[PDB]
Design a protein around this ligand. Structure first.
Ligand SMILES: COc1ccc(Oc2cccc([C@@H](C)Nc3nc4n(n3)C(=O)CC(C)=N4)c2)cc1
Ligand SMILES: COc1ccc(Oc2cccc([C@@H](C)Nc3nc4n(n3)C(=O)CC(C)=N4)c2)cc1
Ligand SMILES: COc1ccc(Oc2cccc([C@@H](C)Nc3nc4n(n3)C(=O)CC(C)=N4)c2)cc1
Ligand SMILES: COc1ccc(Oc2cccc([C@@H](C)Nc3nc4n(n3)C(=O)CC(C)=N4)c2)cc1
Ligand SMILES: COc1ccc(Oc2cccc([C@@H](C)Nc3nc4n(n3)C(=O)CC(C)=N4)c2)cc1
Ligand SMILES: COc1ccc(Oc2cccc([C@@H](C)Nc3nc4n(n3)C(=O)CC(C)=N4)c2)cc1
Lengths: 160, 160, 160, 160, 160, 160
């Protein structure tokens, strides 16, 4: 069906939970666009360029992933990427309720973009980019939760 | 029973979800005070005066609605408006849990002010003022979710 | 106003949580119909005649409560009773989810019947007729959760 | 791709919510197996032969749907059918919790079967086969929630 | 300290999730009573004598565990056993809601019994005795979720 | 078992809900460290020194409580305090979901630190330090929710 899926988010930084979801998406769809939202208003730890480079390196082993950045309305960027599948990761109820609101909003903005929720391994079901950054800024060991390239970049960013 | 109900919130800006709730309240109670909290600390998109004017225009077709602004403790403002009914809208679990805490707190502050939860149409069960503003600031079409006067005011506010 | 409200359920048996909710309803509506479903509850410990007599005695002090048995679809009975307000009690998240489904269904069946959710005192926010029956059947003290007449009828029921 | 997806359940009876989910699945996968469990549902109102015939007629317009009965563990049937995608529908939080448990269990049983959660239209986000049956058995109108053939079979079933 | 803790349930059958919770309890309290309810579970697959023998063998390596059958209200048995700590396991939101209701009820029945909630490993955070039984009865592999003796008894039970 | 428990948080300011939890912990464990996180990035109302002094005065009647401040990773501070028990308070689902993520993270950081959740009285099940501060800054009466010393300090802080 030459299916194109988009997996959007801030990925600040991309975690093993995100790698898990994008890997599951590549096994299901022909082409996956991992889309990184700039979102400067949220004051990200890494620049958009840094996040794109980290995600490209962390997904280099998957042949059907394309990493790109965007500052647009996500649904407009998905239409412009010719995506018909919108990948979401399902971890907690609080995330699920907010994802339900976003999916109904995205369906009003682009009805042909089908929201699909994938479930990560139990190993990453309790992690987030925010939680990993919080632990790391207090010098806690987060090597288990991030791709090697990302872990070294996070340590460097926090070292000033 | 000459019942007076208060429907408080930031209404920044008032949405079709809020119009739905206030319409249901006017069919049940003799007089409904739609109470707009100034809350400058939360940095609202619209000034309190702008929110009051938008809500007055959006509820002008309902004869038993009175739009007012407040900066007081909500329960003190409700007592001062002679309200005995406190209208809340019920959409998601995250909102419900926080509304439960506020209702127990409001009952300690003013036990005769009865919290009543009304449920909006399925059409507005996944929207919020925050979500509409987020979509609009990324140029997404939010005409369906707001009264006409509000939609034009929101576009003007974002146009700088 | 001259609002007619209906508060339906199995009330098997009526608890202090139900008395709390029906009391709050009588403070805001002119007439409250406490509607007892003829259908068996998940138990069903008390017969309809027992449930009606217990509810009548336990609400006798409330001048604007009418206790009535019904066997139809609740909305069909609410319609024939000219009720325009449907009282529901909200204790927790599990309650909320199921009550939201029922409220959207009741609105489809009878749109002129408005669902209103009231919150009981913290005192009764963790009880149900089911829990009370399980504890009492297993020789636990439930005196605090019931009107005196219900406590007497429950002891009589468990003795035989 | 040539992806084979399975959408299992009791479908007792198949509703407009199930038609919505199976339609979305046919738009993203080459072949969709709508798998009907031989096991009784919490009711079980319609026999397996009735459930299959109703689902076949209600999905006849979808060229890539195959309606099939099964009695094994769902994952055992998905495995023998060479399905690599497992379609689930997500309506609310109560659904989510139980579906998460089942998805982790299905991944343990058949890791090559990827669980995918789709969201139905807001129109069907508050219905289930169970709720439809309870309303219809109690003389309530459920026409809007069902395909025409199912509505006809349900009236015939309740008449006898 | 000399704290006596009680960990009650049907344990039909005892799983690796229950072993995980009882092990954590033995690491913090001097004596742990693993209390098996004589009452049938939603199934009830194993008889009380089978449930006790299985739990005894599966906890034999833990020196401070005492496996005991009971038929009374749990709090009545905890009281007579001089337990001051009541062990509960928390896996998900559905568990949490019901456990909160039970904990407030147990505190009313026996205030000197303190409810303590422990979290199992992520490995067992999505299993229950009910789910294990449904999968095994339908010819699914549940070996990973059970102690070896329980796995052997379950195969023997399903064979006849 | 000479058990040492740590009860960490921002306690900005310590409430009657926190006093309830720490009192339950002192009845179960030999020594309880009430650990106050500095967290200057969150812009606390009270300085770390003020929070420590308020908590010491509010827990002076409990002989086995030690109040200390920390700016470290919480798990490292717990190891350095020789704690093997981590006290958490369980009020709402939103808190529970976040507490589940923190407990799995804390278990990866310090597996021998056992997270234990205690449930406060129904009286404090709907309060938080944030909610009390919000009500107080709008001049609402919060005397019921705080120890006397804390209430007077909060009034003084808000009086400028
Ligand atoms: C499931 O819905 C998603 C998923 C990921 C998304 O990625 C991000 C993350 C941060 C910032 C942005 C910015 C650049 N654009 C954007 N587009 C939106 N935004 N924000 C909303 O707030 C709501 C909405 C429906 N569409 C996008 C956006 C929406
Ligand atoms: C259901 O309870 C509600 C509903 C709507 C409300 O409206 C707002 C919105 C934003 C700001 C304010 C300010 C001006 N006054 C206020 N009064 C409060 N506030 N804040 C709380 O934070 C908590 C509380 C119990 N009472 C009021 C307040 C409370
Ligand atoms: C908030 O909705 C309510 C509230 C209380 C109710 O009372 C009961 C309790 C038990 C049994 C019945 C029987 C006699 N009639 C009935 N009417 C229904 N029923 N069952 C459903 O299952 C679903 C539905 C939407 N309407 C009514 C019914 C519906
Ligand atoms: C998302 O998991 C699903 C989805 C739909 C399913 O369909 C049904 C419905 C009713 C009855 C059955 C019977 C025939 N087989 C079955 N297979 C199971 N069963 N029961 C469980 O209880 C748990 C489990 C993980 N697998 C299947 C089964 C599992
Ligand atoms: C956390 O509360 C618990 C935990 C485990 C328990 O174990 C079981 C399991 C199944 C059956 C029973 C029977 C024998 N006694 C019992 N005691 C109860 N029961 N049932 C209730 O239904 C509610 C309640 C508060 N106390 C006990 C009981 C209560
Ligand atoms: C149940 O887990 C808890 C409970 C209370 C805590 O106390 C606080 C409160 C605010 C600030 C801090 C700072 C000083 N240290 C810290 N340590 C952390 N932090 N932050 C996280 O964000 C996540 C995490 C797993 N460990 C600690 C921290 C974690």
């Amino acid at each position: 069906m030459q299916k194109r899926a988009i997996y959007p988010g801030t990925f600040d930084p991309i975690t093993n939970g995100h790698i898990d979801i994008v890997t599951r998406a590549t096994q299901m769809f022909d082409h996956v666009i991992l889309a990184i939202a700039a979102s400067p208003s949220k004051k990200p730890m890494f620049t958009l360029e840094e996040r794109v480079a980290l995600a490209q390196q962390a997904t280099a082993h998957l042949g059907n992933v394309e990493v790109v950045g965007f500052s647009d309305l996500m649904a407009n960027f998905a239409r412009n990427q010719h995506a018909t599948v919108l990948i979401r990761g399902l971890r907690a109820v609080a995330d699920f309720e907010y994802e339900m609101q976003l999916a109904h909003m995205n369906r009003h903005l682009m009805p042909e973009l089908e929201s699909v929720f994938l479930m990560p391994s139990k190993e990453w079901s309790f992690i987030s980019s925010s939680l990993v950054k919080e632990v790391a800024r207090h010098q806690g060991d987060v090597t288990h939760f991030l791709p090697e390239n990302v872990h070294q970049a996070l340590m460097a960013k926090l070292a000033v």
